[PDB]
Amino acid sequence: ERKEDIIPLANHFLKKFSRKYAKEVEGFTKSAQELLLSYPWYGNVRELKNVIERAVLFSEGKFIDRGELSCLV
Amino acid sequence: ERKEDIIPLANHFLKKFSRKYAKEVEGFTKSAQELLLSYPWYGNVRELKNVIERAVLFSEGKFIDRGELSCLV
Amino acid sequence: ERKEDIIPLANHFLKKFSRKYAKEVEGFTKSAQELLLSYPWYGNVRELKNVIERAVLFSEGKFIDRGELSCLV
Amino acid sequence: ERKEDIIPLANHFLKKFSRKYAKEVEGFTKSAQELLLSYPWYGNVRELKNVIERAVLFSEGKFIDRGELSCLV
Amino acid sequence: ERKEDIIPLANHFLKKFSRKYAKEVEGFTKSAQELLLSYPWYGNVRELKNVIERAVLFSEGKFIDRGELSCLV
Amino acid sequence: ERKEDIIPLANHFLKKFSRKYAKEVEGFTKSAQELLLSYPWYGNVRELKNVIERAVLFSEGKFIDRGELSCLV
Amino acid sequence: ERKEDIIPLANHFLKKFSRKYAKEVEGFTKSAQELLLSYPWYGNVRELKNVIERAVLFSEGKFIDRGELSCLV
Amino acid sequence: EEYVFESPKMKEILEKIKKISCAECPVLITGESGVGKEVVARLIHKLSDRSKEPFVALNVASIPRDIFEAELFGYEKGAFTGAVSSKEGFFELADGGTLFLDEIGELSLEAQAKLLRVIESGKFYRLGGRKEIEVNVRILAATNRNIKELVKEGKFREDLYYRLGVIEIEIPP
Amino acid sequence: EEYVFESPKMKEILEKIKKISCAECPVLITGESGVGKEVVARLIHKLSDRSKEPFVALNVASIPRDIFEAELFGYEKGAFTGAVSSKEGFFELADGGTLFLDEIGELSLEAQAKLLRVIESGKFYRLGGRKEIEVNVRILAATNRNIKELVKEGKFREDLYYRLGVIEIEIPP
Amino acid sequence: EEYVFESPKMKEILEKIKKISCAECPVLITGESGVGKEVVARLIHKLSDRSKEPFVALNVASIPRDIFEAELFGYEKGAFTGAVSSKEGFFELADGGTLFLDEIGELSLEAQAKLLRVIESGKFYRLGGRKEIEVNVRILAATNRNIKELVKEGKFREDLYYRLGVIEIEIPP
Amino acid sequence: EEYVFESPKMKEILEKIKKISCAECPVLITGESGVGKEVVARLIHKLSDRSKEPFVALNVASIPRDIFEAELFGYEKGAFTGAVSSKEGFFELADGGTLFLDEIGELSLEAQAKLLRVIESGKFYRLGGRKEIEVNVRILAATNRNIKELVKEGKFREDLYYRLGVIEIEIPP
Amino acid sequence: EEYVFESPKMKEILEKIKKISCAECPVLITGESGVGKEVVARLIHKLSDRSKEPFVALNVASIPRDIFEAELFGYEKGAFTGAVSSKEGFFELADGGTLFLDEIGELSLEAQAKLLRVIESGKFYRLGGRKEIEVNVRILAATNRNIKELVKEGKFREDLYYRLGVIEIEIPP
Amino acid sequence: EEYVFESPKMKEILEKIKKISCAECPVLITGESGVGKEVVARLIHKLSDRSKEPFVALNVASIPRDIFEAELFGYEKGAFTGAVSSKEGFFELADGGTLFLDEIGELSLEAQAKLLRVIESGKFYRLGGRKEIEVNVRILAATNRNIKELVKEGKFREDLYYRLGVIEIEIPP
Amino acid sequence: EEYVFESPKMKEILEKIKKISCAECPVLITGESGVGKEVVARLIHKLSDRSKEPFVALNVASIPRDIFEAELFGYEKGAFTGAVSSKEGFFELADGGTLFLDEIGELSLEAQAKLLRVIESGKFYRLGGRKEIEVNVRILAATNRNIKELVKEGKFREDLYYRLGVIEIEIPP
Numbered sequence A, B, C, D, E, F, G: 001e002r003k004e005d006i007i008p009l010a011n012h013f014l015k016k017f018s019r020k021y022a023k024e025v026e027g028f029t030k031s032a033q034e035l036l037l038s039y040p041w042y043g044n045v046r047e048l049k050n051v052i053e054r055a056v057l058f059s060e061g062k063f064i065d066r067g068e069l070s071c072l073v
Numbered sequence H, I, J, K, L, M, N: 001e002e003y004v005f006e007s008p009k010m011k012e013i014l015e016k017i018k019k020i021s022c023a024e025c026p027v028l029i030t031g032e033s034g035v036g037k038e039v040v041a042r043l044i045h046k047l048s049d050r051s052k053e054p055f056v057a058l059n060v061a062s063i064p065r066d067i068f069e070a071e072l073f074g075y076e077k078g079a080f081t082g083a084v085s086s087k088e089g090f091f092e093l094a095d096g097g098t099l100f101l102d103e104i105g106e107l108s109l110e111a112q113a114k115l116l117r118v119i120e121s122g123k124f125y126r127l128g129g130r131k132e133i134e135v136n137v138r139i140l141a142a143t144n145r146n147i148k149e150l151v152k153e154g155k156f157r158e159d160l161y162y163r164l165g166v167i168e169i170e171i172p173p
């Protein structure tokens, strides 16, 4: 109920971890950003924190889209 | 074989219950007292105990006569 | 003996189920409403409850008339 | 097979109990002594022990004869 | 009513079993194929399944004709 | 199958026990020695050990013959 | 699926043990080497390790052939 | 709408129920099959002080005579091969509320007694041993047979009769 | 290839089945022996939402009337001499799926009741005691006798009729 | 008012009771069912020195023959699957008072013995092991069968007979 | 010496037996009484791969129709008054070997079915419940009646016919 | 007065007892029920050197086969749910005296062995672990069955036979 | 030679493992018995930065639920009758390395919590008192049950789920 | 005199024993009951280098499956209500000598594993914690069941098989 938070938060996280695991990950793609906004996030902020540490590690290029995310969300 | 007991006992009981169920029942009428003395009381003291708890509850006014009793005895 | 109940009740039911099975059924037609009022309803309220869950499912359009009902009533 | 024992034993017992239950019982009468000697005493010494504790208690006066004994033997 | 099935099916079966019982049986002869098509097959697919397991076992050479079949069909 | 053992062994035993229970038993008589040799000794050495401790105790004089032995063997 | 391993491995083992139990065992005979290669070795390397410690101990001369092996393989 | 009572004798019996309201003495209901006995129990209880409290109705015929004295009351562990826990009771489930025993005549002499003991003392024990539970349950017996008769047949304890015979209602066919 | 439906009344009945698809209310099927009842149940279930779920069909005649109330539901340990474990149930095996009771009329009054209780509450207990299991089973009764009749004979509980009589299909010989 | 004794043979038996007063030797009561046996026990005890002391009456028939030797005496823990505590005893509950065993003939040979041992020694142990409890209970056996007979049938220990046969009262029908 | 086969039709039937050797599909033998049916079963099995394995021949007539469905298969405890142990089975005794059911026509519809289920699945359950045993038994039915006929009489399940009718041998009088 | 022995074979057996006096080897007594076995044990012990020492007679039938190997010997703590103290033993209670095991045939194979070990070594351990106690008990077995037979039935250890079969007395009916 | 991974979904899962390499967040592995869970943990750790560091795998089922909260963590002296020294811990033994808790669902609510506290704080105390030890252990939970479900059953703490649910791998049968 | 071996296959097996002399690898003996397995173990050990060393034979059936993993190995204090001292072990008692586990198939999966670990490492710990004892015991397993089979039944660990299957002797009935 704060879809206006998912994309900013997520982006926070993607930054934390991208720096924590030294990964050249800059950010999410549109296709991905959508998904993140549609997911119900039962865990809420917590679950997104995990979903993205996980997506940062699984990340291969500079961005994240339906690819790594769908694996979870 | 103690008809001299029925009316006193009965009267005991009518008191117990009249007080137990908060009923404005003072006592038996002549017509009633007769019946009680004629009944054979197979159950004896026990049966009279019941017959009257029952008559105290069934009681409507201040007294008990052929009315409620006949229902049983 | 409450024909003034059949049409209101029925209408209750038709609503319950129309919503329970996601059926675009709005209500009964005159022709149908008549029948419902003439049926003896031995089962009474119960039988009407069934007769209509059944009629809601069997329903094809937006309304119910002699058609589906006669199948039963 | 020791009728020479019945009367002495018995007399032992009558003493034990007469003292055990504080009964003014001194001993058996002839009439009684006979009986005791005729009884077959299947239980033997045991049965006589009982028969007399029992006779000591049942005793009313100072002696025991056909009276209390016959009750048993 | 699927005579276009008998010969293909049969051929399926003859393969199953020829392999199941290690029999050098390759297939049916014309003469045989005819029969199979004329039989009424009350049991239908089932009966043909049996008729041929049976014919595969009874088989002596590389083929099956009026010979083994007539035994049944 | 060592009848050449029965009489020596036996004699061993008869010595052990004769000394164990302080019995003036010197040895077996011919008549006895025979028996010991004929017995099948299912228990073998063991059974003879027992048979003789037993015979040493049962012994009355200085020797053992058919007497005590037959009791067993 | 490494029959190219059985004979070398085996030979490893036969050396280990021949030295471990001080046995003058030099190696396997052709006849034996064959068997070792045909056995399925479900246990694989492990089973061969055992099969040969066992064959080294059972060994009588300087070599091992169908003899000791068949006992197992 | 409502329920149905309009004949004199029943116009009556309803009231008798109403009066009995403020009571707890057991009640003995008797009428042919179908007459409305179990309908009266239910009404007596809807009217008693404990209406909101549970109603534990149990057909005494709906249980093999050898397991009634195991389910009515309860059961103390390991006394009968296989016991997952000392068994609770309909008496215990009916604690604080009504316990409508239907078809009373079908009570074994053993339980007829065991009930009596609980109608007077109100305490009971599951099998051999002693009482360790407190139950406050109003007894409501209903039977279609004639109790009295059964008493001369010895199939029905008399003292248990008079005990349940405190209040007695008879439904006419 | 396919199955067989082509006569009007059946061209129909198939559809009725199709519509009923999205439902779970019990269904009462009736037709002479051989008419295809048990073939319709099976089809109803192939079409219901729970097609992939199990189909627990059990002939109510294929079990002695005294052991049906022991196998349909289940059994609580030591209540009948010899119990290797509290007995599971066709109801429990049919949990999540369909339970096609064939030849309903052959249900004992005791189970006719016991079923009703599970058609409404959906909870059941194995013998004396209480419910401790959760079963979601769609009832599918089929009988070749005329239910209604049986109701005036008292051999068949009426309320259990209307309960299964939610959806009723009649196969013409 | 009072109780009832007026026939000669009973005018008697009452006294026999009165005399026996100051005693504690067991007593064997015998008469047909209903004759008043259990009424005499109760009276014997109302008259014994220990009237104010408890009266532990237990029907030997009111308990499965396999659990009598578990409830009369008591039970030492873990000897039979499931034991919440070493089981007390009616003997222990009757300690200091009377223990009226009704229907004696119905005693298992095993307990008939086990009782004897406690009638003489007065000490008992719950199951295997040894006595660790002190009980002072006056035995009062009553049976409606003919003891002697049972002795030739081997169903009743003789020595246990004579032991309870100290004082013997016979109630005439 | 040897056995006896020399007429053409039998000179034949022997071979048919020999070929069938390497098989396990059930076999249906039919001929008038005495023709040698049960002699062929026995020979078929002496020749099958499982000759050394047991031969469980059982006359379906040598057992009251109500106890066949109790001895062929087996029996789950306490389902019929008195059960010393869940009953084993001729199917279980014949596990791994042949099961020669003589006089098939004499199979109750109930078992005719129950057999079919075991000819296809190979699994069976003793009474109500589920299969918990693994049996590998080759069916060998022999009957002197004409099966087909019985099928139009409804006394013999057709699908069970074709199932046993895999291999069919007919002994001429 | 005295006891009773006057028939030749018993006029005898008494003496055999007298001779055996100065011994301790186990003794095996055998005769039909009632013949006087347990009367001889008792006499053997009244005559042995340890007459003044205890007599621990225990009926091997008077204890469930699963608790004999718990009471004869003893029990090491926490090995069976619930242990108030490692359990002593009749062997330990009989230490220094006689241990008359009545009805030997009724010994479990497990104890038959466990006894043997204590008849030879004289040392025993309560359950798993090792011996830590010293017992000097003279074994006196009496049984009414024929031992030898039981040996071919495998119900009775042979070596345990010969071990108790040191001295063997047979009481004629 | 090597190990075995070749199917797509696993060709995958291996990589997921490889990527996770440079991490330490707990990992939740789930698949039916035998699927290779514990084989993946082991591989994850062979690949993590701490491969050379210890691998403390402990089956949560291989220890009575009442002693897990005594061995996982550790134990502060004299808190449970008998303590030779405050007990170390698998957590402490796994310090610096991996701690593969197998079959997580089998964690008591008490430890499920106690773990959570150590997954976040990383500090723990042996029993009552406070943390005085420093442990750096990477959690690796593997279970064959469905976690989520257990969460609606209340048997599994949710917050502990998401905490271990950082990285989640699911092995397909 | 001597012992008994004269048939070829045994004339053999004796030698196999003799050769195995200078070894310590476990040995797996298998033959029907009575064939002489435990007689061979004993002989193997009389012949091994450690003949003078102890022989700790223990029937794996002669101990309740729940206490084997408490007596084979040993026990760490206070881990099971009541512990007089951390329990020693048959492994520890067999240290330096042979440990003949009879009837291996009867090993719990938990111990089957726990043994394996000690057959390879030779170190063991009593309950939860770590190994602190040094045992040098030669394993000698004998079973009358067919191991291999049990492996497909999952009742017997395979790797534990091959480990004991170093030397394998099979005694023919």
Ligand SMILES: Nc1ncnc2c1ncn2[C@@H]1O[C@H](COP(=O)(O)OP(=O)(O)O)[C@@H](O)[C@H]1O
Pocket (backbone or CB within 6 Å): B009, B012, B045, B046, B049
């Ligand atoms: N004499 C009496 N006076 C007053 N109430 C009595 C009298 N006798 C009995 N009752 C009452 O009647 C009931 C009958 O009691 P009870 O003494 O047990 O009878 P019984 O003679 O059968 O032992 C009792 O609950 C008591 O309250």
Ligand SMILES: Nc1ncnc2c1ncn2[C@@H]1O[C@H](COP(=O)(O)OP(=O)(O)O)[C@@H](O)[C@H]1O
Pocket (backbone or CB within 6 Å): C009, C012, C045, C046, C049
């Ligand atoms: N007056 C009503 N208005 C709406 N629905 C009703 C009414 N009466 C009954 N129903 C419905 O019909 C069914 C009949 O219910 P119920 O009250 O149990 O009948 P009965 O009178 O036999 O007790 C119920 O499931 C309920 O949902």
Ligand SMILES: Nc1ncnc2c1ncn2[C@@H]1O[C@H](COP(=O)(O)OP(=O)(O)O)[C@@H](O)[C@H]1O
Pocket (backbone or CB within 6 Å): D009, D012, D045, D046, D049
């Ligand atoms: N000879 C006797 N003289 C006195 N009293 C005896 C005599 N014999 C037995 N009694 C008494 O009789 C009872 C019988 O005792 P007991 O010696 O046990 O008999 P039994 O011969 O059956 O062993 C004992 O309690 C004892 O007090």
Ligand SMILES: Nc1ncnc2c1ncn2[C@@H]1O[C@H](COP(=O)(O)OP(=O)(O)O)[C@@H](O)[C@H]1O
Pocket (backbone or CB within 6 Å): E009, E012, E045, E046, E049
């Ligand atoms: N169309 C088919 N093609 C190949 N084999 C078939 C075909 N139909 C049936 N069979 C075989 O024939 C047997 C008949 O099977 P089944 O489907 O059960 O018949 P039914 O129509 O009576 O249900 C099966 O065991 C199967 O292997």
Ligand SMILES: Nc1ncnc2c1ncn2[C@@H]1O[C@H](COP(=O)(O)OP(=O)(O)O)[C@@H](O)[C@H]1O
Pocket (backbone or CB within 6 Å): F009, F012, F045, F046, F049
């Ligand atoms: N050859 C022998 N010479 C003297 N005494 C023997 C001899 N053999 C056995 N015994 C005695 O017989 C008993 C049988 O002993 P044992 O050696 O155990 O027999 P087994 O052959 O069954 O092992 C022993 O107690 C021993 O004292």
Ligand SMILES: Nc1ncnc2c1ncn2[C@@H]1O[C@H](COP(=O)(O)OP(=O)(O)O)[C@@H](O)[C@H]1O
Pocket (backbone or CB within 6 Å): H003, H004, H005, H031, H032, H033, H034, H035, H036, H037, H038, H039, H040
């Ligand atoms: N007085 C009544 N008014 C309305 N319904 C009644 C009345 N009496 C009985 N019934 C109905 O008749 C049925 C029979 O009820 P019940 O009283 O339980 O039988 P029984 O008297 O044998 O126990 C009930 O389902 C109830 O709805």
Ligand SMILES: Nc1ncnc2c1ncn2[C@@H]1O[C@H](COP(=O)(O)OP(=O)(O)O)[C@@H](O)[C@H]1O
Pocket (backbone or CB within 6 Å): I003, I004, I005, I031, I032, I033, I034, I035, I036, I037, I038, I039, I040
């Ligand atoms: N409409 C149908 N189309 C094809 N086959 C049918 C049809 N109806 C019945 N059958 C067949 O007839 C047989 C009788 O089936 P069934 O419905 O189970 O009998 P009943 O109606 O008495 O329960 C089945 O084996 C089935 O294959």
Ligand SMILES: Nc1ncnc2c1ncn2[C@@H]1O[C@H](COP(=O)(O)OP(=O)(O)O)[C@@H](O)[C@H]1O
Pocket (backbone or CB within 6 Å): J003, J004, J005, J031, J032, J033, J034, J035, J036, J037, J038, J039, J040
């Ligand atoms: N002599 C008596 N005087 C008064 N009442 C008696 C008398 N004898 C028996 N009773 C009554 O008869 C009933 C039967 O009693 P009871 O003695 O217990 O039977 P039993 O003799 O079979 O044990 C009792 O309830 C009691 O009130």
Ligand SMILES: Nc1ncnc2c1ncn2[C@@H]1O[C@H](COP(=O)(O)OP(=O)(O)O)[C@@H](O)[C@H]1O
Pocket (backbone or CB within 6 Å): K003, K004, K005, K031, K032, K033, K034, K035, K036, K037, K038, K039, K040
């Ligand atoms: N072909 C045969 N050769 C030799 N003996 C035979 C032959 N056929 C039958 N028999 C004998 O005839 C008897 C009848 O056998 P059987 O086959 O069991 O009868 P049925 O065919 O009715 O089952 C048998 O005892 C058997 O020895």
Ligand SMILES: Nc1ncnc2c1ncn2[C@@H]1O[C@H](COP(=O)(O)OP(=O)(O)O)[C@@H](O)[C@H]1O
Pocket (backbone or CB within 6 Å): L003, L004, L005, L031, L032, L033, L034, L035, L036, L037, L038, L039, L040
């Ligand atoms: N020889 C005897 N002389 C005197 N009494 C005996 C004699 N033999 C047995 N008895 C008696 O017979 C009873 C049976 O005794 P017991 O020997 O214990 O039986 P069993 O031989 O079956 O063990 C005893 O109570 C005892 O007093």
Ligand SMILES: Nc1ncnc2c1ncn2[C@@H]1O[C@H](COP(=O)(O)OP(=O)(O)O)[C@@H](O)[C@H]1O
Pocket (backbone or CB within 6 Å): M003, M004, M005, M031, M032, M033, M034, M035, M036, M037, M038, M039, M040
């Ligand atoms: N992908 C795999 N490649 C090779 N071996 C495997 C693989 N997966 C499992 N195994 C083997 O299967 C066995 C089962 O292992 P494990 O993963 O521990 O079971 P679980 O998944 O239930 O914890 C192991 O001994 C291992 O050698």
Ligand SMILES: Nc1ncnc2c1ncn2[C@@H]1O[C@H](COP(=O)(O)OP(=O)(O)O)[C@@H](O)[C@H]1O
Pocket (backbone or CB within 6 Å): N003, N004, N005, N031, N032, N033, N034, N035, N036, N037, N038, N039, N040
């Ligand atoms: N080859 C043999 N020579 C002499 N005695 C043997 C031989 N084999 C077995 N025995 C005897 O048979 C008995 C059975 O022994 P055992 O080997 O322990 O049984 P199992 O093989 O089942 O473990 C032993 O007491 C032993 O004396």
